[PDB]
Nucleic acid binder design. Structure first.
Length: 557
DNA sequence: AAAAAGACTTGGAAAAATTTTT
DNA sequence: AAAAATTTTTCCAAGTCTTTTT
């Protein structure tokens, strides 16, 4: 182990002093198809050249996916699959609709069938294989210590698949070559040798970054990286600091609210726009809303990027007055609909930036993340739209606890409302078939284990009844042994009852990871002797190894 | 100050592992 | 074992924010 958190923090600016690694692990060569796995065009058989058979297969491996039916996918795919076609093959294949892939598909399926039940030796064999790879490449060296590499395996080539109505879906992710990679490391570390007879694209030494490799995505023309694992004194130190910055805000929070509140009424167009945006960002945990290069990602939004056509306005609605009806496509394209009753002053004000605008006009023109953060970073150091979602939620957790953690009860009773309370604190964020109806043939079943040890237990009396010794009275203590062991096996599922029914559409996998100070939980643990291993899992504990070792029941966010 | 590039963190989906039911 | 129900892991897109550049 290595308690880096007890170490003296680095100067502002520098990230590391020494860096060394074996670079990346490119993808495996293309394995051509057996002579007996045929492709078809216009019914006629056809043996595609490598690069084209390669792209051809990415489609085949996806046939059964509805994605393949959508226009933009079939459009984009062909467009590219064509690029990768040999001149003589282009004159033949002109549509992709006459292309019978049914064979290649049927081929890979069986291939998966053979991989879904193979030699118990092949399993333990490859498991020894992957581990082998994870020994040479899965780790790197940063400043006097070996530290885990997050994603050493480079992205294999294949058909791109964005989220939602993505315009690029179907395009082809090219296979990265040692020529497209950039290794980083220090001026004094040993530069890793690119595969036999190849060459890196650049080998810069830069202690200002934290990445080991990096190449550009040829689809969005963006940048991919390869960075350390969560347990890094580099990823963690930043996550820790993430929860620290949220703590500061925990002080001057009230001073910012009563602030921007008396900001809605500002003669200046700017400001009055900012404060509103900022308002929702605090009330409905929205996302800043950084503008998007039109055409690259599917149409989606955020607070700052909201258009007049995304919000409606009702003076009086569903009883409550002054209502702003939000309805737009958020991140990943997970829709956000929710009528919200705001402040009278915010509604009239909201209506302000509502005149002289078509539905496709920026609701908050003359405002944007830049201005918004630039200001929050004046009101407080490092404060940025985001910190809010982490602060609010973070405090409700330390809250909910003293709201449902009895001063002494069965463990389950704790982990009960614990992972139950924090539920509403993972849906106000809005994070998103035959499984529950499958609880009866189970719950009813084990629940009957109740009446099991219920009747009997009567044998606790029936037996040590008239009888008056101690040998017999040894069946009564055993009775109650089946009593907490099952009553729990009853209470140990009473949650999933309130969970899955109050946590369906709104998932919370982000909650128990990001936005919540792990200390809030690690201290609560130590407090009631509850084991950490019970809430978090093998990996989690490893990312929060700092929040475990240095937090006492005495901790307060 | 404005846009574009570069850098990280967020977060859901799919594949893989482990457990539980048939 | 075989199958289905869960949980943990891998994977990478999509965002936020920060720096660079003009």
């Amino acid at each position: 182990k290595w308690k880096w958190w007890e170490e003296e923090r680095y100067p502002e600016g520098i990230k590391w002093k020494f860096l060394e690694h074996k670079g990346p692990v490119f993808a495996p060569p293309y394995e051509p198809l057996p002579e007996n796995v045929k492709f078809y065009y216009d019914g006629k058989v056809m043996k595609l050249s490598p690069k084209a058979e390669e792209v051809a297969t990415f489609f085949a491996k996806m046939l059964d996916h509805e994605y393949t039916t959508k226009e933009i996918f079939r459009k984009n795919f062909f467009k590219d699959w064509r690029k990768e076609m040999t001149n003589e093959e282009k004159n033949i294949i002109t549509n992709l609709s006459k292309c019978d892939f049914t064979q290649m598909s049927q081929y890979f399926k069986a291939q998966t069938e053979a991989r879904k039940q193979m030699s118990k030796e092949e399993k333990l064999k490859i498991k020894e294989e992957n581990e082998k790879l994870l020994k040479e490449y899965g780790f790197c060296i940063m400043d006097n210590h070996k530290e885990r590499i997050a994603n050493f395996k480079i992205e294999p080539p294949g058909l791109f698949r964005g989220r939602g109505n993505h315009p690029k879906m179907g395009m082809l992710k090219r296979r990265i070559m040692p020529e497209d990679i950039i290794i980083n490391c220090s001026k004094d570390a040993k530069v890793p040798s690119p595969p036999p007879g190849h060459k890196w694209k650049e080998v810069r030494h830069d202690n200002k970054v934290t990445w080991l490799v990096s190449w550009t995505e040829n689809i969005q023309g963006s940048i991919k990286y390869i960075m350390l694992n969560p347990s890094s004194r580099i990823k963690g130190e930043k996550d820790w600091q993430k929860y620290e910055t949220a703590r500061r805000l925990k002080k001057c929070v009230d001073k910012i609210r009563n602030q921007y509140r008396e900001d809605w009424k500002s003669k200046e167009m700017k400001v009055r726009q900012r404060a509103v945006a900022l308002y929702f960002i605090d009330k409905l945990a929205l996302r800043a809303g950084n503008e998007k290069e039109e055409g690259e990602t599917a149409d989606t939004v955020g607070c700052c990027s909201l258009r007049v056509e995304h919000i409606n306005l009702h003076p009086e609605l569903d009883g409550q007055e002054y209502v702003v009806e939000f309805d737009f496509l958020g991140k990943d394209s997970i829709r956000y609909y929710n009528k919200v009753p705001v402040e009278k002053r915010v509604f009239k004000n909201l209506q302000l930036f509502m005149e002289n605008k078509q539905p496709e006009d920026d609701l908050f023109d003359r405002l944007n993340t830049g201005i918004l953060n630039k200001h929050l970073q004046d009101l407080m150091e490092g404060l940025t739209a985001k910190v809010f979602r982490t602060y609010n939620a973070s405090i409700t957790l330390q809250q909910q606890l003293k709201e449902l953690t009895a001063p002494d009860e069965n463990i389950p009773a704790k982990i009960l409302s614990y992972n139950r309370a924090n539920r509403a604190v993972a849906i106000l964020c809005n994070h998103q078939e035959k499984s529950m109806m499958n609880l009866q043939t189970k719950i009813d079943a084990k629940k009957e284990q109740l009446a099991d040890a219920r009747r009997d237990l009567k044998s606790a009396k029936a037996d040590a009844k008239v009888m008056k010794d101690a040998k017999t009275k040894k069946v009564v203590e055993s009775k109650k042994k089946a009593v907490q062991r099952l009553e729990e096996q009853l209470m140990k599922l009473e949650v999933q009852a309130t969970d899955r029914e109050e946590n369906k559409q709104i998932a919370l996998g982000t909650s128990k990871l990001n936005f919540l100070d792990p200390r809030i939980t690690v201290a609560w643990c130590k407090k009631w002797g509850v084991p950490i291993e019970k809430i978090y899992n093998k990996t989690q504990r490893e990312k929060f190894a700092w929040a475990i070792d240095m937090a006492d029941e005495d901790y307060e966010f």
